[PDB]
CSV table of C-alpha atoms and ligand atoms in Angstrom, one decimal:
chain,number,residue,atom,x,y,z
A,1,UNK,CA,0.0,0.0,0.0
A,2,UNK,CA,1.6,3.2,1.3
A,3,UNK,CA,0.8,1.9,4.8
A,4,UNK,CA,2.8,-0.8,6.7
A,5,UNK,CA,2.2,-2.7,9.9
A,6,UNK,CA,3.4,-1.4,13.2
A,7,UNK,CA,2.9,-2.3,16.8
A,8,UNK,CA,-0.6,-3.2,17.6
A,9,UNK,CA,0.2,-2.9,21.4
A,10,UNK,CA,1.6,0.6,20.8
A,11,UNK,CA,-1.6,1.2,18.7
A,12,UNK,CA,-3.8,0.1,21.6
A,13,UNK,CA,-2.3,2.8,23.9
A,14,UNK,CA,-2.5,5.4,21.1
A,15,UNK,CA,-6.3,4.5,20.9
A,16,UNK,CA,-6.7,4.8,24.7
A,17,UNK,CA,-5.0,8.2,25.0
A,18,UNK,CA,-6.3,9.8,21.7
A,19,UNK,CA,-9.5,8.1,20.6
A,20,UNK,CA,-11.2,6.4,23.6
A,21,UNK,CA,-12.6,9.7,24.8
A,22,UNK,CA,-15.0,9.5,21.9
A,23,UNK,CA,-15.2,6.0,20.6
A,24,UNK,CA,-15.4,2.3,21.4
A,25,UNK,CA,-14.1,-0.5,19.2
A,26,UNK,CA,-15.7,-3.6,20.5
A,27,UNK,CA,-18.6,-5.5,18.8
A,28,UNK,CA,-21.7,-4.5,20.9
A,29,UNK,CA,-19.8,-1.3,22.1
A,30,UNK,CA,-22.0,1.8,22.3
A,31,UNK,CA,-21.9,5.0,20.4
A,32,UNK,CA,-20.5,7.8,22.5
A,33,UNK,CA,-19.5,11.3,21.1
A,34,UNK,CA,-18.4,9.3,18.2
A,35,UNK,CA,-19.7,6.1,16.8
A,36,UNK,CA,-18.7,2.6,17.8
A,37,UNK,CA,-16.1,1.6,15.2
A,38,UNK,CA,-16.5,-2.2,15.1
A,39,UNK,CA,-16.4,-3.4,11.5
A,40,UNK,CA,-15.3,0.0,10.1
A,41,UNK,CA,-12.9,-1.6,7.6
A,42,UNK,CA,-14.5,-2.1,4.3
A,43,UNK,CA,-17.7,-0.1,5.2
A,44,UNK,CA,-18.4,3.3,3.8
A,45,UNK,CA,-18.5,6.4,6.0
A,46,UNK,CA,-21.8,7.3,7.7
A,47,UNK,CA,-23.4,3.8,8.0
A,48,UNK,CA,-23.3,2.8,11.6
A,49,UNK,CA,-27.0,2.7,12.7
A,50,UNK,CA,-28.3,4.9,15.5
A,51,UNK,CA,-25.6,7.6,15.1
A,52,UNK,CA,-26.2,11.1,14.0
A,53,UNK,CA,-23.4,11.8,11.5
A,54,UNK,CA,-22.8,15.2,9.9
A,55,UNK,CA,-24.0,15.8,6.3
A,56,UNK,CA,-20.3,16.0,5.4
A,57,UNK,CA,-19.3,12.6,6.5
A,58,UNK,CA,-22.1,10.8,4.8
A,59,UNK,CA,-21.7,12.4,1.4
A,60,UNK,CA,-18.0,12.0,1.4
A,61,UNK,CA,-18.8,8.3,1.1
A,62,UNK,CA,-15.3,7.1,2.0
A,63,UNK,CA,-14.6,3.4,1.7
A,64,UNK,CA,-12.5,2.8,4.9
A,65,UNK,CA,-9.3,0.9,4.2
A,66,UNK,CA,-6.1,1.0,6.2
A,67,UNK,CA,-5.0,3.4,3.6
A,68,UNK,CA,-7.8,6.1,3.5
A,69,UNK,CA,-7.8,5.8,7.3
A,70,UNK,CA,-4.2,7.0,7.3
A,71,UNK,CA,-4.8,10.1,5.3
A,72,UNK,CA,-8.0,10.8,7.4
A,73,UNK,CA,-6.1,10.6,10.7
A,74,UNK,CA,-3.5,13.0,9.4
A,75,UNK,CA,-6.1,15.8,9.4
A,76,UNK,CA,-9.7,14.7,9.7
A,77,UNK,CA,-11.1,18.2,8.8
A,78,UNK,CA,-8.9,18.5,5.7
A,79,UNK,CA,-10.1,15.1,4.6
A,80,UNK,CA,-13.9,15.6,5.4
A,81,UNK,CA,-14.4,19.3,5.5
A,82,UNK,CA,-17.3,19.9,7.9
A,83,UNK,CA,-16.9,16.7,10.0
A,84,UNK,CA,-17.7,17.3,13.6
A,85,UNK,CA,-14.9,15.1,14.7
A,86,UNK,CA,-12.8,17.5,16.8
A,87,UNK,CA,-9.4,15.8,16.5
A,88,UNK,CA,-6.4,17.7,15.1
A,89,UNK,CA,-4.6,14.8,13.6
A,90,UNK,CA,-1.7,12.3,14.0
A,91,UNK,CA,1.1,13.8,11.9
A,92,UNK,CA,3.7,10.9,12.3
A,93,UNK,CA,3.2,8.2,9.9
A,94,UNK,CA,4.7,5.8,12.4
A,95,UNK,CA,1.9,6.7,15.0
A,96,UNK,CA,-0.7,6.2,12.4
A,97,UNK,CA,0.8,2.8,11.4
A,98,UNK,CA,0.8,1.7,14.9
A,99,UNK,CA,-2.9,2.9,15.5
A,100,UNK,CA,-4.2,1.4,12.3
A,101,UNK,CA,-2.4,-1.8,13.1
A,102,UNK,CA,-4.5,-1.9,16.3
A,103,UNK,CA,-7.7,-0.8,14.6
A,104,UNK,CA,-7.3,-3.5,11.9
A,105,UNK,CA,-7.2,-6.0,14.6
A,106,UNK,CA,-9.7,-4.8,17.2
A,107,UNK,CA,-12.4,-3.8,14.8
A,108,UNK,CA,-12.8,-7.2,13.1
B,1,UNK,CA,-16.0,38.3,42.6
B,2,UNK,CA,-19.3,36.3,42.4
B,3,UNK,CA,-20.6,33.2,43.9
B,4,UNK,CA,-21.5,30.2,41.7
B,5,UNK,CA,-23.2,26.9,42.9
B,6,UNK,CA,-22.6,23.6,41.0
B,7,UNK,CA,-24.9,20.7,41.5
B,8,UNK,CA,-22.6,17.8,40.8
B,9,UNK,CA,-23.9,14.5,39.3
B,10,UNK,CA,-23.7,13.0,42.7
B,11,UNK,CA,-26.2,15.5,44.0
B,12,UNK,CA,-23.7,17.5,46.1
B,13,UNK,CA,-23.8,21.3,45.8
B,14,UNK,CA,-20.3,22.8,45.2
B,15,UNK,CA,-20.3,26.5,46.2
B,16,UNK,CA,-17.4,28.5,45.0
B,17,UNK,CA,-16.3,31.9,43.8
B,18,UNK,CA,-14.8,33.2,40.5
B,19,UNK,CA,-14.0,36.6,39.1
B,20,UNK,CA,-16.0,38.3,36.3
B,21,UNK,CA,-14.5,37.4,33.1
B,22,UNK,CA,-13.4,34.0,34.2
B,23,UNK,CA,-14.7,31.0,32.2
B,24,UNK,CA,-16.8,28.4,34.1
B,25,UNK,CA,-13.9,25.9,33.4
B,26,UNK,CA,-11.5,28.3,35.0
B,27,UNK,CA,-13.8,28.3,37.9
B,28,UNK,CA,-13.8,24.6,38.2
B,29,UNK,CA,-10.1,24.2,37.5
B,30,UNK,CA,-8.7,26.9,39.9
B,31,UNK,CA,-10.9,25.9,42.8
B,32,UNK,CA,-10.2,22.2,42.4
B,33,UNK,CA,-13.9,21.3,42.1
B,34,UNK,CA,-14.5,17.5,42.4
B,35,UNK,CA,-16.3,17.1,39.0
B,36,UNK,CA,-15.2,13.9,37.3
B,37,UNK,CA,-13.6,14.5,33.9
B,38,UNK,CA,-14.6,18.2,33.7
B,39,UNK,CA,-12.4,20.2,31.3
B,40,UNK,CA,-10.8,17.2,29.4
B,41,UNK,CA,-9.6,19.2,26.4
B,42,UNK,CA,-8.7,22.2,28.6
B,43,UNK,CA,-11.2,24.3,26.7
B,44,UNK,CA,-10.5,23.9,23.0
B,45,UNK,CA,-13.9,22.6,21.9
B,46,UNK,CA,-12.7,19.0,21.4
B,47,UNK,CA,-14.8,17.5,24.2
B,48,UNK,CA,-18.2,17.6,25.9
B,49,UNK,CA,-17.0,17.3,29.5
B,50,UNK,CA,-17.6,20.9,30.5
B,51,UNK,CA,-21.3,20.8,29.6
B,52,UNK,CA,-23.4,22.7,32.1
B,53,UNK,CA,-27.1,23.2,32.4
B,54,UNK,CA,-28.0,26.9,33.2
B,55,UNK,CA,-31.0,28.6,34.8
B,56,UNK,CA,-33.3,29.8,32.0
B,57,UNK,CA,-33.0,33.5,32.9
B,58,UNK,CA,-29.2,33.2,32.8
B,59,UNK,CA,-29.2,31.0,29.6
B,60,UNK,CA,-31.2,33.5,27.5
B,61,UNK,CA,-28.7,36.3,28.0
B,62,UNK,CA,-25.5,34.2,27.3
B,63,UNK,CA,-23.3,35.2,24.4
B,64,UNK,CA,-24.5,33.8,21.0
B,65,UNK,CA,-23.4,30.2,20.6
B,66,UNK,CA,-20.8,29.6,17.9
B,67,UNK,CA,-20.9,26.8,15.3
B,68,UNK,CA,-17.8,25.3,16.8
B,69,UNK,CA,-19.4,25.0,20.3
B,70,UNK,CA,-22.6,23.7,18.8
B,71,UNK,CA,-20.8,20.8,17.0
B,72,UNK,CA,-19.2,19.7,20.3
B,73,UNK,CA,-22.3,20.4,22.3
B,74,UNK,CA,-24.3,18.2,19.9
B,75,UNK,CA,-22.4,15.2,21.2
B,76,UNK,CA,-22.9,15.8,25.0
B,77,UNK,CA,-24.8,13.5,27.2
B,78,UNK,CA,-27.9,14.8,29.0
B,79,UNK,CA,-28.5,17.8,26.7
B,80,UNK,CA,-31.2,20.2,27.7
B,81,UNK,CA,-32.7,23.4,26.2
B,82,UNK,CA,-30.4,25.4,28.7
B,83,UNK,CA,-27.2,23.6,27.9
B,84,UNK,CA,-23.8,25.2,27.0
B,85,UNK,CA,-20.2,24.2,27.1
B,86,UNK,CA,-18.8,25.9,30.3
B,87,UNK,CA,-15.4,26.6,28.9
B,88,UNK,CA,-17.0,29.0,26.6
B,89,UNK,CA,-19.1,30.9,29.2
B,90,UNK,CA,-17.5,33.7,31.2
B,91,UNK,CA,-18.7,35.1,34.5
B,92,UNK,CA,-20.9,38.2,34.4
B,93,UNK,CA,-22.6,40.4,37.1
B,94,UNK,CA,-25.9,38.7,36.5
B,95,UNK,CA,-24.6,35.3,37.4
B,96,UNK,CA,-23.9,36.1,41.0
B,97,UNK,CA,-25.4,33.4,43.1
B,98,UNK,CA,-26.6,31.4,40.0
B,99,UNK,CA,-26.8,27.6,40.0
B,100,UNK,CA,-25.5,25.3,37.3
B,101,UNK,CA,-26.1,21.6,37.0
B,102,UNK,CA,-23.6,18.9,35.9
B,103,UNK,CA,-25.4,16.3,33.9
C,1,HEC,C1,-13.4,14.6,20.6
C,1,HEC,C2,-14.1,13.3,20.1
C,1,HEC,C3,-13.3,12.6,19.1
C,1,HEC,C4,-12.1,12.0,19.1
C,1,HEC,C5,-11.0,12.4,20.1
C,1,HEC,C6,-12.0,11.3,18.0
C,1,HEC,N1,-13.1,11.1,17.2
C,1,HEC,FE1,-13.4,10.0,15.6
C,1,HEC,N2,-15.3,10.8,15.5
C,1,HEC,C7,-15.9,11.7,16.3
C,1,HEC,C8,-17.1,12.1,15.8
C,1,HEC,C9,-18.1,13.1,16.5
C,1,HEC,C10,-17.3,11.5,14.6
C,1,HEC,C11,-18.5,11.7,13.7
C,1,HEC,C12,-18.2,12.6,12.6
C,1,HEC,C13,-19.3,13.3,11.8
C,1,HEC,O1,-20.4,12.7,11.8
C,1,HEC,O2,-19.0,14.2,11.1
C,1,HEC,C14,-16.1,10.7,14.3
C,1,HEC,C15,-15.9,9.9,13.3
C,1,HEC,C16,-14.9,8.9,13.2
C,1,HEC,C17,-14.6,8.1,12.0
C,1,HEC,C18,-15.7,8.0,10.9
C,1,HEC,C19,-16.7,6.8,11.2
C,1,HEC,C20,-17.6,6.4,10.1
C,1,HEC,O3,-18.4,5.5,10.5
C,1,HEC,O4,-17.6,6.9,9.0
C,1,HEC,C21,-13.6,7.4,12.2
C,1,HEC,C22,-12.9,6.4,11.3
C,1,HEC,C23,-13.0,7.9,13.4
C,1,HEC,N3,-13.9,8.9,14.1
C,1,HEC,C24,-11.9,7.4,14.1
C,1,HEC,C25,-11.3,7.9,15.2
C,1,HEC,C26,-10.0,7.6,15.7
C,1,HEC,C27,-9.2,6.3,15.3
C,1,HEC,C28,-9.6,8.5,16.7
C,1,HEC,C29,-8.4,8.6,17.5
C,1,HEC,C30,-7.2,9.3,16.9
C,1,HEC,C31,-10.7,9.4,16.7
C,1,HEC,N4,-11.7,9.1,15.8
C,1,HEC,C32,-10.8,10.5,17.6
C,1,HEC,C33,-15.2,12.1,17.5
C,1,HEC,C34,-14.0,11.9,18.0
C,2,FES,S1,-13.3,21.8,28.2
C,2,FES,FE1,-13.5,20.6,26.3
C,2,FES,S2,-15.0,21.8,25.1
C,2,FES,FE2,-15.0,22.7,27.0
């Protein structure tokens, strides 16, 4: 790709410190501020039921792959202008590789 | 300085003082109020933990809500018609002795 595997353990702690405030990853996990992300890989943006997405996310219709996800995480608002996800971004590719490695695994 | 009362989620009333111009997050942070998780993003509109529920007469004269606050506020738990993000609300004369509720 333009994405390579990292440390899932490192990625777990990245999740906890940077994403857990708003999201769950487990199957049967609830929506919070943000939507539960189980099964995100391969699904298009805006399709978790019971969550109120912005117009912007839905119409962006991103197919979530480890690769898209990387560009998204760099700068969410640059990627989906108008998203209400209030997260600045993960500028280091190594951080993103770690986190996505952990998401790839925990969201299946 | 003015008195502000906070009804915490446990039901305990926290009575404290802040200076006019201070945000409600400033009030919580400086006085070490025991409100679990309050002020997570340290007032940058990236969290909903500073959500407070205001008295109606206070609420109606608050500064116009910005789109940025609204997007974050939309995600808060226990939203009411008198809800604002506290880190955006600064103390005014009219708030002396007011009560806010932590949902
Ligand atoms: C301050 C809360 C917040 C944080 C922190 C946050 N998100 Fe989000 N996230 C949201 C919200 C709100 C949405 C919904 C966006 C909308 O509808 O525009 C979102 C949407 C998402 C989406 C799109 C989901 C879909 O079904 O299309 C992904 C992927 C995502 N977040 C991943 C994460 C990851 C991974 C992190 C950790 C770096 C993270 N987010 C950090 C709030 C947050
Ligand atoms: S402290 Fe996070 S938005 Fe108020």
